[PDB]
Every structure is written in structure tokens, then in C-alpha cells.
Amino acid sequence: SLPTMPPSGYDQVRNGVPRGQVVNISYFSTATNSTRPARVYLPPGYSKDKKYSVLYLLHGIGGSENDWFEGGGRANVIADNLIAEGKIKPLIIVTPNTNAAGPGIADGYENFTKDLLNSLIPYIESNYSVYTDREHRAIAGLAMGGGQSFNIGLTNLDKFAYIGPISAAPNTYPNERLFPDGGKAAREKLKLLFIACGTNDSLIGFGQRVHEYCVANNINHVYWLIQGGGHDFNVWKPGLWNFLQMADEAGLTRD
Ligand SMILES: COc1cc(/C=C/C(=O)O)ccc1O
């Protein structure tokens, strides 16, 4: 039963397995007044005659849109295999550059919230055949990106129903800011809150803090610790593997 460590080969490429296409895109950002990059995983069968859900996957501090793919995440391989095994239905995964910096901008990681919601999401929904409602939109990430997942996801429950912060960093908002209503909206609209981290990670306390608040305030969620895991992709890959399946079970790809 999930969550659990994935079996050997979950992140390996094997002959015959259908592979999705990872495309490179650039979109205009009203948040940075510049063109920004992102990568988009289209499943092996992506057809404009069908509709797909979308997972916005965020990298760590100083990272890039390539981190979750060739940079170590192998998100496309993990997705290809789960799809081939019938573990999850086909879906689209988008990896942006989380540091929306530029002239006139003080904090690019905070500025990223508007970039994602007002520029990247509209670009994706206009160029790809995707659902545009909260029930078909998820957000997850590692470290700094896990913090942004908590921050953006919980303060925008009308946009995301599935949130997966892995090894969330100190940029994670205080509990009072994540749940300004004592967790009311969360208990009603949150379909999946998946918090994971390696037991050896020095940043374990931040995800732990949110976990404790959710326990105290009756917010359902999944809290999974990777035994012996550190601040690396041997925690983040297993994290994504579990999140995709648990989100699927929760209805992310419904229809
Ligand atoms: C904003 O503060 C912090 C961010 C990080 C991010 C780490 C990562 O993305 O791997 C670590 C420690 C911090 O105090």
C-alpha cells in the first residue's frame, strides 16, 4: 500500500515502453516583463482530441526547468513507467524556472507565484488540451520548490486540489499564513496533501511543522518519511513516484 519505496527499475528506461515527449517552451511573463523557459512532458499518446490534467513540478533553490528531467528527477521516465503499468492515467507535467527574477523585482521566488498563476498557467491551457479546473491541477516540488508548493497551493486552494511538498525548505510560510482560516478551506477543498522528506535531511523540521499543525487542526494529509533519505534525488524521485499515484487515486486524472 502507498506510500512505499518504489521497486527497482521505476526510474529506468526499458525497450518497448512507450515514451512521452518532453518539449521546450518559452512564454511571456507579465510578472517579469520577459520571456521565461519551461519544459512540458506530454504522455506517449498525447492527442489534442483528449483532455489531460496538469502537474506543475518545482525545482530547488538555484535550479532550473531541467532539474526534474535530465537534471536528476527523470520525471518523464517515472511517468512513462507508471502509465505503462496502468498505475496512473496519462497526464501532463510542467517544470518551470522557479526564480522569477528580473529588473525591479526584489524576490524572484516570491514573484514566481504571480508568474505561475497569471502567465504560465494561461500559456499551458492555451497551447495544450488540458482541463482548467482545480480538480485537475496539482503542484509539487523539492526543497525550495516544496516550500513554494505549500505556499502557492495552500493559499490558492481554488486552483489546486493536490499538493505535494517534498523536503520543503524554510521559505515555507508560517502556519498562520498557510492556513489563515484555521484550515477551514483545506478541510473542504484539499483532496491530497502529500508531505514527504528524508529522515536524514536537516530541513525535516519545516515539513514536520506543517504536519503537526494539520494534526492539531484536523487536516487530512499523508506524511511519509524516506528512511535513511537525505537531501537528494533518492528522496525526490521516490516522492514523485508516490505522489503521482496517490494524486491519481485522489482523482487528479478523473475522466
Ligand atoms: C529560504 O531559506 C532556505 C532555503 C533552502 C533551500 C534549499 C534547497 O532548495 O535545496 C535551504 C535553507 C534555507 O534557510
* Ordered DSSP codes for 18-76: ---EEEEEEEEETTTTEEEEEEEEE-TT--TTS-B-EEEEE--TT--TTTTTTTTT-HH
Q: What CATH number is attached to the domain comprising 44?
A: 3.40.50.1820
The minimum-distance atom of ligand 1 relative to the CA of 171 is: 1
Q: How far is the CA of 203 from the centre of ligand 1 (A)?
A: 8
Residue 129 φ/ψ, nearest 5 degrees:
-80, 85
Write the CB contacts of 206 (distance below 8 Å, at least 6 apart in sequence): 147, 168, 169, 170, 172
2 Cβ closer than 6 Å to some ligand 1 atom: no
Question: Strands 34-42 and 21-29: what pairing?
Answer: antiparallel
Helix-helix angle 233-249:75-84, to 10 degrees: 40
Residue 235, CA distances (Å) to 21, 62, 82, 90, 255 in order: 24, 19, 18, 23, 30
144 in contact with ligand 1, CB cutoff 6 A: yes
**Structural domain of residue 167, as residue ranges?**
1-255
60 lines ligand 1 (CB under 6 A): yes
**Strand 192-198 versus strand 222-226 pairing type:** parallel
The CA angle 120-250-126, to the nearest 5 degrees, is 25
For 251, phi and psi rounded to 5 degrees?
105, 10
Q: Ligand 1 pocket, 171 CB below 6 A?
A: yes
Residue 61 Cβ < 6 Å to ligand 1: yes
Q: Are 183 and 217 in contact (CB under 8 A)?
A: yes
Q: Of 248, 204, 56, 253, whose CA–CA distance to 140 is shortest?
A: 56
Task: Report resolution (Å) to 1 decimal.
Answer: 1.8
Which atom of ligand 1 approaches the CA of 61 most closely? 9
CA 52 – CA 54 distance, rounded (Å): 7
> How many domains are there within the chain?
1
Please give the radius of gyration of the chain, using alpha carbons only, rounded to the nearest integer: 17
CB 28 within 8 A of CB 49: no
Ligand 1 contact via 232 beta carbon (within 6 Å): no
Cβ contact 254:135 at 8 Å: yes
Strand, helix or coil for residue 137 = strand
Cell 485522489 locates to 250
Residue 224 sits at φ, ψ, to 5 deg, of: -125, 125
- Experimental approach: X-ray
Residue whose CA lies nearest to ligand 1 atom number 14 = 170
